[PDB]
Amino acid sequence: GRVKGVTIVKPIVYGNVARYFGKKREEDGHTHQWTVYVKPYRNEDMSAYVKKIQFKLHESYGNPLRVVTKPPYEITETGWGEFEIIIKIFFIDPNERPVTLYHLLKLFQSDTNAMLGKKTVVSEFYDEMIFQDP
């Protein structure tokens, strides 16, 4: 915890989208395409201060520790069940503690949203990254 620059606060959104295939895939029983993500709230480039974002997927996925080193910070897969993703954001300067986020991958639409005629599932949450200007 060393003071190296001015403290900056950046709003972010994180979570996932998912789309029902329509019919189950015969090969693996998958039913959905999904994309898990972290994004700045505003339209800006976070690679100035973020080195990489890791998305730790369920152990049924190959290379489940997925790392994205440049924008966009997204991983797209297919699946059939819901699970917890651990998201870890690493800064350029290792003086900064990584931000660890926890997110339940949502594939199944709520009955409320299904009744409001919404095609795609969206489960999105908010945060503020606090770090020093490098």
Instruction: Give dist(CA 84, CA 115) in Å, integer.
Output: 26
Is the CB of residue 39 less than 8 Å from the CB of residue 73? yes
What secondary structure letter does DSSP report for 114? H
Nearest to 52 by CA among 96, 108, 8, 5: 96
Q: Is the bond into 72 cis (omega within 30 degrees of 0)? A: yes
Domains and CATH numbers, the chain: 1-134 (2.60.40.1970)
* Bridge-based pairing state of the strands 65-68 and 7-20: unpaired
DSSP sequence for 37-97: EEEESSS--GGGTEEEEEEE--TTSSS-EEEE-SSSEEEEEEESS--EEEEEEEESSTTSP
Count the residues in the chain.
134
- CB atoms under 10 Å from CB of 64, counted, come to 12
What's at 5, amino acid-wise? G
Resolution reached, in Å?
2.1
- Tell me the two tokens of residue 72: 């966009």
Nearest to 8 by CA among 54, 42, 36: 42
Instruction: Give dist(CA 89, CA 26) in Å, integer.
Output: 36
- Tell me the two tokens of residue 66: 């997925």
Instruction: Give dist(CA 10, CA 132) in Å, integer.
Output: 11
Is the CB of residue 83 less than 8 Å from the CB of residue 64? no
Instruction: Give dist(CA 133, CA 84) in Å, integer.
Output: 31
Contacts of 83 (CB under 8 A, 6+ apart): 57, 58, 104, 105
